[PDB]
Paper text:
The enzyme responsible for removing O-GlcNAc from proteins is O-GlcNAcase (OGA),23 which is a member of glycoside hydrolase family 84 (GH84) of the CAZy classification system. Inhibitors of O-GlcNAc hydrolase (OGA), the enzyme that removes O-GlcNAc from proteins, lead to increased O-GlcNAc levels in cells and are seeing widespread adoption in the field as a research tool used in cells and in vivo. Structural data of inhibitors in complex with an hOGA homologue reveals the basis for variation in binding among these compounds.
To assess the structural basis for this stepped decrease in potency observed on going to the 2′-aminobutylthiazoline 15e, we determined the structure of Bacteroides thetaiotaomicron, a bacterial homolog (BtGH84) of hOGA, in complex with the parent 2′-aminothiazoline 11a, the tighter binding 2′-aminopropylenethiazoline 11b, and the butyl derivative 15e, which shows greatly diminished binding. In all three structures, the respective inhibitor binds in the active site in a conserved mode with an invariant hydrogen bond pattern for the aminothiazoline moiety. Propylene derivative 11b matches the size of the pocket, requiring only a minor adjustment of the C278 rotamer and showing favorable hydrophobic interactions with W337, T310, and Y282. Thus, the size of the pocket disfavors substituents longer than three carbon units in chain length, and those inhibitors having such larger groups induce unfavorable conformational changes within the active site. We also noted that the selectivity ratio for hOGA increases as the 2′-aminoalkyl chain length increases to the three-carbon propyl (15d) and propylene (11b) derivatives, but this trend reverses once the chain length increases further, as seen for the 2′-aminobutyl analogue (15e).
Residue numbers in the entry: 4 to 14, 16 to 46, 51 to 649, 654 to 715
The structure:
């Protein structure tokens, strides 16, 4: 209804937008708010509309109703008068943003509102690894922040070469500089502080030469319009991690630059130890920063872990040490460590009562800018009014705002694209919770030979139908073309999941052998299509491919497919393959966890899925990979957790050529030097059983 929800709102009657109005204070009030107001409109005889900041003539009558907080405002609508009065210029702009949401069909509700943020700095840090947001995406983002009362945008793409090492020393070229100039201007028009960050720690020298280069870079950005600045020391090693040096540098920028210019706003640093588990208690890095860094300077913090939600105990832990309220860097929805997943679910987990305990709250988003508006909108609501923060309603409101013409379809898509999957940070999100109980019940019964509930079967049927509807509708949506460009690969994979799910359910209901077999063949072809999408879309270097509906739906479908094929093989004494993911290559083994470990293709690599359990490698047993063709080989790398095995390659499986594995901490490796390869074979040739841990088994070929 109103986002963010105001601190104070008074319920009844309806007032039409005055066809004739008298404007009071258009020449004294925030020009950015006036422009918004004249846009919403279209003389002295008419109804009075008072706009202005506390102190202006236009609103002196309502001085006692205007909240005495920065960015606060007072809004009133009744039959005779409209009041739009901020405590300051940004507060007046934020009054117009709320006013704009109130306007419906030219009709306004009779309301009185007192409002202001609970958290002083609220917004976004473009701080991820990956392709930095496009210029057109950044322009759209700033307008979005202004509409949602987010007042902070911290520019810091890790892979922008003029942000980080070594070319943080170099001024932006004319083209990029002109774009940053535009960004800064658009930010100002939308009441957003543009904070330009620099990331010099990996190669900074603690000498005068690098100090001066950093300040000269800051001066250039200031000439481009930048009035807020940040220095990042995250994700570095070496002398740059020295807290005393970091604090002296930031205090120098403060005293010789930030407090020398007339109009610099935020000065922010992010530390090397930026979460609790990365803090070494055997030293005292954080208390050195807390005590030496000038108190006006902000210190960023991601929580108890690199990826974590903010708790009351956690914020108190850090605050005691840095001697000031932490400026939260919240690592959601950033996906740069799970780049084959979209993270489109609700924003939750952050304590709603600790607004006084944080200096700021910013979200690190996905490199998918439009897709991140779901989380950004929700953080905007949370940060402005946490006590009233409504996780699910705000998620639904965000989707309806981003894609009104297809909000139900985006909800369906987002609901099943929210978990991260397994990852090194251990961070997960709920997903598909609506249908998860019916999936769990259906699969337990089916596996056990008990009757499943008809209602559960139909819930699954319904889900797959709605998934196909939503996929096809989103693909053709033209209301937010940039969004659809971002999600399309996942949309394609999402539809394929839904079609597969339908066909497996028909295998469950199947009543004759011929019909079952058509469905089985259809499922296999769909598996092959998902493999194709996984290999040709989103081919980034770290987590290539496209994964969707991974927490609940894909396991349901795969396990149901496997179970019904097992039942068919039993019933008809048949030997249908029950594999659930297409794999063009083959692998066979006499060792067994390995025999059932699936191969994977990632870029030009062919690898055995690593396991976690003990692999007992018997005396004579082996593992042999057979590729679907002859390829020029690059290397083989193995990791067993070696005077017992023998690595051989071949083009025909008859004539073999032994390859010698080189040993090292990084472990068993061997170059192939473009030799043709189709078969790789690893055979235990010693006499005692050798138990191992397959951490990796990877062949790389030239494509
Ligand atoms: C307060 C400092 C936090 N800085 C961080 N730098 C890194 C970010 O650039 C990543 O996007 C993020 C997710 O992979 O992990 C850490 S968090």
């Amino acid at each position: 209804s109103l986002q963010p929800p105001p601190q104070q709102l008074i319920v009844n009657k309806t007032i039409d937008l005055p066809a004739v109005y008298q404007l009071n204070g258009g020449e004294e009030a925030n020009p950015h708010a006036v422009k918004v107001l004249k846009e919403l409109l279209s003389s002295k005889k008419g109804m009075l509309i008072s706009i202005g900041e506390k102190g202006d003539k236009s609103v002196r009558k309502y001085s006692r109703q205007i909240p005495d907080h920065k960015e606060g405002y007072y809004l009133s609508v009744n039959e005779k008068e409209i009041v739009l009065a901020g405590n300051d210029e940004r507060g007046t702009y934020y009054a117009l943003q709320t006013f704009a949401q109130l306007l419906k069909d030219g009709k306004l509700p009779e309301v009185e509102i007192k409002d202001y943020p609970s958290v002083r700095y609220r917004g976004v840090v473009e701080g991820f690894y990956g392709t930095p947001w496009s210029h057109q995406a950044r322009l759209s983002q700033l307008k979005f922040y202004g509409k949602n009362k987010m007042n902070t945008y911290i520019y810091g793409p890790k892979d922008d070469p003029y942000h980080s090492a070594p070319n943080w020393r170099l001024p932006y070229p004319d083209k990029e500089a002109a774009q940053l100039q535009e960004l800064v201007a658009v930010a100002n028009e939308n009441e957003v502080d543009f904070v330009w960050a620099i990331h010099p720690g990996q190669d900074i020298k603690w000498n005068k030469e690098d100090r001066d280069l950093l300040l000269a870079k800051f001066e250039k950005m200031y000439q481009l319009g930048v009035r807020s600045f940040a220095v990042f020391f995250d994700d570095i090693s070496g002398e740059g991690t020295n807290p005393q040096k970091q604090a002296e540098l930031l205090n120098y920028i403060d005293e010789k630059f930030a407090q020398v210019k007339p109009d610099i706003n935020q000065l922010v640093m992010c530390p090397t130890e930026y979460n609790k588990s990365w803090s070494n208690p055997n030293g005292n890095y954080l208390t050195t920063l807390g005590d030496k860094l000038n108190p006006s300077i902000q210190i960023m913090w991601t929580g108890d872990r690199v990826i974590s939600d903010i708790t009351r105990d956690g914020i108190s832990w850090i605050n005691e040490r840095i001697k000031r309220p932490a400026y939260i860097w919240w690592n959601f929805p950033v996906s740069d460590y799970v780049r084959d997943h979209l993270l489109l679910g609700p924003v939750y987990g952050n304590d709603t009562t600790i607004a006084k305990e944080m200096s700021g709250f910013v979200t690190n988003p996905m490199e998918h800018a439009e897709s991140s508006k779901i989380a950004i909108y929700s953080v905007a609501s949370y940060a402005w009014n946490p006590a009233k923060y409504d996780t699910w309603q705000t998620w639904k409101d965000a989707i309806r705002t981003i894609l009104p013409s297809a909000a139900e379809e985006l909800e369906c898509f987002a609901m099943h694209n929210s978990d991260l999957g397994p990852n090194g940070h251990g961070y997960r999100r709920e997903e598909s919770m609506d249908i998860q109980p019916a999936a769990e019940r259906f699969l337990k019964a089916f596996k056990e030979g008990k009757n499943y509930d008809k209602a559960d079967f139909e819930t699954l049927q319904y889900t797959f139908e709605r998934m196909k509807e939503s996929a096809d509708i989103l693909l053709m949506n033209t209301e937010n073309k940039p969004l659809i460009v971002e999600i399309t690969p996942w949309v394609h994979q999402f539809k394929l999941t839904a079609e597969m799910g339908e066909e497996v359910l028909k295998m469950v209901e199947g009543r004759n052998e011929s019909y079952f077999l058509r469905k089985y063949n259809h499922v296999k072809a769909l598996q092959q299509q998902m493999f194709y999408i996984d290999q040709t879309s989103n081919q980034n270097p770290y987590q290539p491919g496209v994964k969707t509906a991974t927490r609940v739906i894909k396991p349901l479908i795969d396990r149901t497919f496997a179970t019904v094929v097992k039942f068919f093989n039993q019933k008809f004494n048949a030997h249908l393959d029950a594999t659930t993911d297409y794999m063009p290559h083959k692998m066979i083994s006499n060792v067994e966890q390995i025999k059932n470990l699936p191969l994977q293709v990632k870029a030009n690599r062919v690898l055995i899925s690593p396991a976690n359990e003990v692999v007992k490698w018997a005396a004579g047993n082996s593992v042999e990979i057979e590729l679907d063709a002859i390829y020029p080989g690059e290397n083989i790398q193995i990791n067993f957790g070696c005077t017992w095995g023998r690595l051989e390659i071949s083009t025909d499986g008859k004539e073999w050529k032994t390859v010698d594995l080189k040993q090292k901490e990084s472990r068993l490796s061997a170059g192939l030097q473009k030799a043709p390869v189709k078969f790789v074979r690893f055979t235990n040739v010693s006499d005692e059983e050798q138990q191992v841990y397959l951490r990796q088994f990877v062949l790389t070929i030239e494509k």
